[PDB]
Amino acid sequence: MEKYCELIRKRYAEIASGDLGYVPDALGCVLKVLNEMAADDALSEAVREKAAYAAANLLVSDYVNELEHH
Amino acid sequence: MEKYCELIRKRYAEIASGDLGYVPDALGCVLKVLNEMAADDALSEAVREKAAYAAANLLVSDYVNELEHH
After folding, report:
1. Which family does it belong to (chains A, B)?
2. Which of A29, A59, A58 minimizes the C-alpha distance to B1?
3. What is the 3-class SS of chain A, one letter each residue?
4. CB within 8 Å of A61: residues ≥ 6 apart
């Protein structure tokens, strides 16, 4: 937990405490956000690429059934 | 796979084909990128928050041992 920036640590504490809700489909949640960023022309190409690669790598991994997760 | 943007589908095909490398720690890879974005003052606060929330949610989920991953 220590390696994460302040904002992630804050929001982690808030999900855990019930100040924020929790999304049980946690892999789906990360894929949704990474997909939005990858597609966001308002973001730099470097940022879009970083998001895209992490998403693609997760899909090709065995953590997700990339055809049928959602 | 169909719901993802073109960039993610392209990079997925490239990891799968060997035009790009693969990162076996796929959950670590998504957490690293989300953490970089969450901390990036060059990105809008809305974008930072979307990245932070998805990362925090993944950490609190049981997909990752958030203290001891990596």
Report:
1. Belongs to the UPF0253 family.
2. A59
3. CCCCCHHHHHHHHHHHHCCCCCCCCHHHHHHHHHHHHHCCCCCCHHHHHHHHHHHHHHHHCCCCCCCCCC
4. B22, B24, B26
Distance of CA B53 to the CA centre of its chain: 12
Query: Rounded to a whole number, what is the distance in Å from the CA of B36 to chain A's nearest CA?
Result: 8
Solved using: X-ray
The verdict on a CB contact (< 8 Å) between B34 and A38 is no
* Residues A54, A34 contacting (CB under 8 angstroms): yes
Asked if the C-beta of B7 comes within 8 angstroms of chain A's C-beta atoms, the answer is yes
Helix B26-38 vs helix A45-60: angle between axes, to the nearest 10 degrees? 160
Record the resolution, in angstroms. 1.5
Cα gap B32→B53, rounded to integer Å: 14
Q: With contact defined as beta carbons under 8 Å apart, do A38 and B8 qualify?
A: yes
The alpha carbon of residue B53 is apart from the nearest alpha carbon of chain A, in Å, by 6
Beta-carbon separation of A59 and B4 below 8 A: yes
